[PDB]
Write an enzyme that holds these catalytic residues in place. Sequence first.
Site, PDB file in Angstrom:
ATOM      1  N   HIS A  73       0.880  -1.002  -0.034  1.00  0.00           N
ATOM      2  CA  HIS A  73      -0.200  -0.052  -0.041  1.00  0.00           C
ATOM      3  C   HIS A  73       0.745   1.078  -0.134  1.00  0.00           C
ATOM      4  CE1 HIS A  73      -0.042   0.319   4.576  1.00  0.00           C
ATOM      5  NE2 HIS A  73      -0.201   1.711   4.312  1.00  0.00           N
ATOM      6  N   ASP A 101      -0.442  -7.669   1.944  1.00  0.00           N
ATOM      7  CA  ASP A 101      -0.047  -6.188   1.907  1.00  0.00           C
ATOM      8  C   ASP A 101       1.619  -5.957   2.001  1.00  0.00           C
ATOM      9  OD1 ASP A 101       0.549  -3.734   1.626  1.00  0.00           O
ATOM     10  OD2 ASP A 101      -0.887  -2.808   3.467  1.00  0.00           O
ATOM     11  N   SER A 207       3.713   2.751   7.856  1.00  0.00           N
ATOM     12  CA  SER A 207       3.620   1.723   7.058  1.00  0.00           C
ATOM     13  C   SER A 207       4.949   1.294   6.409  1.00  0.00           C
ATOM     14  CB  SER A 207       2.611   2.109   5.984  1.00  0.00           C
ATOM     15  OG  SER A 207       1.343   2.275   6.712  1.00  0.00           O
TER      16      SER A 207
END
EC number: 3.4.21.-
Length: 970
Positions: A73, A101, A207
């Site tokens: 992502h 992911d 992230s």
Amino acid sequence: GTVNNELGYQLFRDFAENKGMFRPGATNIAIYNKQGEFVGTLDKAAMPDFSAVDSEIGVATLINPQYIASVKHNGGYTNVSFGDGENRYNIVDRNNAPSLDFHAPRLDKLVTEVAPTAVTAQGAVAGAYLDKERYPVFYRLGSGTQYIKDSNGQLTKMGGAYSWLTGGTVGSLSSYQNGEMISTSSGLVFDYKLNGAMPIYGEAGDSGSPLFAFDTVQNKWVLVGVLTAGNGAGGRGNNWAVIPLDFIGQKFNEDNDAPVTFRTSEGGALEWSFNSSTGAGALTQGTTTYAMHGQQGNDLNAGKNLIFQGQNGQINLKDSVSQGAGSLTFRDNYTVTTSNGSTWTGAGIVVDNGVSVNWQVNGVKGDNLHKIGEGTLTVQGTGINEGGLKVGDGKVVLNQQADNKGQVQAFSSVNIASGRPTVVLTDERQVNPDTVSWGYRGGTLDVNGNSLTFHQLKAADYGAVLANNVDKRATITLDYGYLFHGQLKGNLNVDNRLPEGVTGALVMDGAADISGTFTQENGRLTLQGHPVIHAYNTQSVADKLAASGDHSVLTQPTSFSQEDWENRSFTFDRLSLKNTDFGLGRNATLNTTIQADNSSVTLGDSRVFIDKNDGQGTAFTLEEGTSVATKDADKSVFNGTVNLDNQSVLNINDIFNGGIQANNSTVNISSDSAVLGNSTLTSTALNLNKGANALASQSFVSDGPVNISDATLSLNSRPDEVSHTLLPVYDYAGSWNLKGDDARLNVGPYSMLSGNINVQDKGTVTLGGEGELSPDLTLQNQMLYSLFNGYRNIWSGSLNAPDATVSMTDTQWSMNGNSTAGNMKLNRTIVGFNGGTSPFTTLTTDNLDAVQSAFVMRTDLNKADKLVINKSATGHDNSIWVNFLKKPSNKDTLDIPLVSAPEATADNLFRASTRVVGFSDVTPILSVRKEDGKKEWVLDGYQVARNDGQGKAAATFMHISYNNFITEVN
Ligand SMILES: [Ca+2]
């Protein structure tokens, strides 16, 4: 990231950057509260090296020299940088996992600056990361949105994502989604027992940020996963995706063409045709053939890797090959030839450890060949190669050959990075020296006997080594002030001969260990230690945090007042200095012979330097400031010899151990730990100034003054130690000149002292103290010890010291002119007058305490030498010897006062000698009378000498052995 507001923010900053106490390998790092309370300790393993993590935002981590690991992502970033940031590696295939992911992007080049991290040996095994036995600890770092949380869960935002890195600890992690994902309540940032010593929670922008774990089965740190989410700002916990082993295996493998094996049997070479526009090629050893793919248009992902093997391969290029992001890997020795001027470019070459590849193929302008693996790449093309070089591991030997125009160039620039690699120059035509730079953590440039000239040393840090590893010595001529962070090593000289009238300092906060000479002419040279680099922020972020009462946030990498400095050491055969200003600052040790001509040399110079860009790469910003070492551990050290000539100045303010050979110069000492060995000063004052404390540990000879102002000079031995290894020494000055109340001249046993002693103020001179000779004495040591004649100390000179305290034990004092002392203490000492007879000599003191001591005055029957005591005389068993310089006759009479003292003094404090000195063969007769306000001892007769079985009389007082003197007294 979110951290608790109890710990100082700088910890998290330094932790994330591997700086300050958090350098790779640091062990047992203790952590403390803002209120100074102990919260925990990083003691389960040594601090890990985070340098596989991208340096700017920490969203990606290098897991192979050509592949990062992050979350899919994260779709925007197209490039990453490593180490100090001075590089750029571009994504050529995001390599997205289709159900997880997670992605594992292939890069354009092989990374040279850092090693990739190891990944979890287990991967997605359900529950594995809860076993504290296998994984005691988990660390993370990231640059997501940065907050601090208080006690009551309130959040203050210090900055946005992608501004700076923060790092910290994380608790043990439970698995979900069949072991593919893991999670923990990392948001409980005050719970140290659960989350480790420095809890941190990941926020938006964190992230992809890595999670590392220490794996006690393998005894090493391991990347386990990458961060996917959390429960919002200040939330309870985070999730990570565990590095997927089958997936990253597929990503690596799918980039490799089939493995290319050479067999000699199939004949000549492997011929490498490549069709440009299709981006395809083959490798044909006559019969057999091997597919190869390269770049296609602007698409670097179309290239595939080649892996070359088989004993003593050989490959020839027919076409220029453009390999795109395909790399070469040599598992066996190969030679790669080309007559067409076929180039090659690609992601890079890896040479496996113990493998050598002779590479005779040029690059291409505007490209850079990247070399890694631990083996050796011998670069042997012909002509000017216009390509560049980035090396990161093993060896590169530059052996480029000349074309038919005689031009030669191995590469247009060479960059040396990561600390692992060495670049060897076969000769001086391979490269322009100024185009060699050292990146993050450096590596070695081995000049291999060739002497060279550098107008710059483009070096990021201390890992930058310039060296010579063969016995053909070579000189490095420099010619740019200027800062070098690097090291100089091995079989070299270094010339820094500036043209006249320059005032730019050459500054070295790196190190040196060379076998030859370092020459500076004109300018400044400053060798010094190097403050520990720390993380920092802008002034606004430091203020916001100051606003909230945390003052820990730094605004520059290094500063003059920080306590943590790295010690540096500089070693040369010789440090030759002409017309320079030379300084050795704090945290440095110098081991050399200094040969100075019209130069100053300040050992323990308080002027030192910082680089405002220190740790950001090869660009530097010098600033000069003041930093004085107060703790012994930070103090400069000097060992060796200082030859001074022709107006040179030597300032000793550090831990000094050396002999001084000086002509027409000066030495000033303010250090309180200087040890001077064998020294000779000719037209050279020696100044010890206030607070200084020096030992002349061997012989010391000056034709000049030795000025002691409120300092302490000890000869041969110190007065707080008893030594059993003393050697007899000389100690000669034109004058010993004390001033100020606190001055001290301590002259140890077995010192032969010469020169007048002059004291202004109430300083203290002490002749003699405890100490024994070594059993092991040279012949000269024996021949000199003999000249002491049984005395521990001999002094020849006159004493001008009206308010001084003077003290002599077991001494023979030959006094050469009138002498004054405030307070004199004699103990088993003999004083002999040796001034004029033109008028005789006087010793005047205020207070004399005298014990088992003697005075030998000379007479001509008309007059004599005289002891005058003004205020008090105390002690016992002293003798007056009289050297009758004319044989007295009883047809003639004697009336000469020899000692005068206060009237209250005991009569027998002074008695006539029992023995003779001189030619006269008579003893003195001494009568006490009072007279003009003082008791006098009067020579008023003589006595036919008693022969007490001693042999012949001493011809002068210099011939009075100590045993003679002492047995007379007894
Ligand atoms: Ca791919």
